[PDB]
Amino acid sequence: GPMRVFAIGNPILDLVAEVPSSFLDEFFLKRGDATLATPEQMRIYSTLDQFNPTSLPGGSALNSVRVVQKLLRKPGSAGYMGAIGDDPRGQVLKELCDKEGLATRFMVAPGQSTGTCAVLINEKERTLCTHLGACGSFRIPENWTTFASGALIFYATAYTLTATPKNALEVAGYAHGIPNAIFTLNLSAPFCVELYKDAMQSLLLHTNILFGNEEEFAHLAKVHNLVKVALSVANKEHAVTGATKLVVMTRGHNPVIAAEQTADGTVVVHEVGVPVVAAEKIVDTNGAGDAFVGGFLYGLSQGKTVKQCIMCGNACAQDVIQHVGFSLSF
Template sequence: MAQDLRGALVGFCNPLLDISAVVDDKLLSEYGLKANDAIMADEKHLPLFQTLIDKYDAKFLPGGSAQNTLRGAQLLLPEGSAVFIGAVGKDENAQRLKDAADKAKLRTNYMVHPDKPTGTCALLITGHDRSMVANLSAAEKYDFSHAKDPENWKDIEAARFYYITGFFFAVSPDTIEAVAKHALENNKTFTMNLSAPFVAEFFTAHVEKTLPYINILFSNETEAEALSKALKLGTSDIKQIAKRVADMPRAGSKPRLVVFTQGAGNTVVASSDSDEARLYGVKPVPHEEIGDTNGAGDAFVAGFLAEYMQGKPLDTCIEAGHWLGGQVVRQVGPNYPEGELKFVPSGSFAPALEKI
């Protein structure tokens, strides 16, 4: 009998319309940007968005990290499995985001801000790298009052899995705390993504406060290193960071899983109930097939969660994440391939085990 997953996954983040363009290093330098980074826009970055539209071949793409993840997960899950929550403006860009979600059959429950425009994210593509600059605007105005409204809290109560990005610490830590506590009190699964190095650096207190509730933590290697520095873990070794974070105090009895991706390098997985790190090799995407790497991390989490929610083994979850990430890097921007997406596990995907 098929598992009932209706409304099983709820995600929170900042819904943003991506403005994507291939640029040169000179433009990055002009705005003080790194080739593979994610930051919040400040006043000096605001002209950048119009510059991309006026001077480059800019494309408008549906974005926002968790919304990208939930779109991908929903494409692999039965219809109605996922719900995304965040704040948008009352404008055309909000409709563009909703249309993209509708296409993936992802249900959205937006808080609509009457005065602020929908947030945007500049994606500056240099080679296979991408630099992201987010202007949150309406997304920044998401308020916990929306989540706790009885009609909206029904989505939280119905869900069994939660996914929130670290970006949301800058917007509504109250929402994160409430959802995390609900998950703990009801024996549900609470997952988060560090999302960007600045999250660990500037929101350390929020990360430390939330970590006991996190059952699965996702990150890439640069975010993991930033976390190690912020928490004073005393190591830059990715395997050691993963294990030390997995072993930090937990609320409740569930073990904590820590999953660190490293692009084309091994994905590192550590758990609080094992003294071995699992190292999963990534099947390389041929260089000529790569569009850009934007959205690959979001897609990895999407593939992982889609299998995890269906009770599949960890090896299968990781393989699905790698597979879906590989599909997205073949596109331009955080897009999924057209047509039906179906993951078929190889049956022979296994990690190398290393004592830590």
């Protein structure tokens, strides 16, 4: 059907820039980290101009559904919901999506500024500093299921829990009632895993596919019980007819580890190898995961196998890290 994937997320505007470490320390930031801007960190948004920053659509899930749409081609092949501000920024972000053919229904938070992310590039590492703004006002509308009518793949990032666990919870609870419908979620960041414990727990029980990276899965493991492969197999209990129960754990250049529980409690795990990419060819790792999940969901809606799904993602991620931040044409 037209709409293959449906996702909710935080539509934010990205401000990219290569900055010196001295910058990281002045704005009390840890290289590689991802966090919400503090009051003393609100200054970065301005002071960035002295670094000829670049600007473009951001938002984890937005990027993912974006990869989907591009590969699916048809308009509204991927639908998306979220909240932008009633400012010029949100208009630009919205115009961009439409130009892509993405089906979207954005909610506007009057008097609020669209969210912005300071993507700090130092070394090859990416440092994310965000100010959600309007994003925190996201509320899933009374007719969402009608808008995303026919989609069998529903996606949501943990980043969305900051506004309210309700959104994902709601979306998650809908797909679960739909036979053949699957719910997928991303750990987004250590902090999500760390702050949305209780809610995360309830949503997990409804997740058919869980995505994340070593770092997040590690925090996940510790918080809950369980505390690579073990962490991965550990997480599968939290989710645990036979409706798909898969957990994909990415590990930078190391093999991707995927563990799934079959209808008969049989556990099958796969360690997928990542094709070598010379260090020098690597530009940055910003948007790597998003590119990965995108490839995955694409192949998924295509009926390919997990391993095969893991391969498409690897490809997408690979193309992207060989470009300055997130890029769209493959």
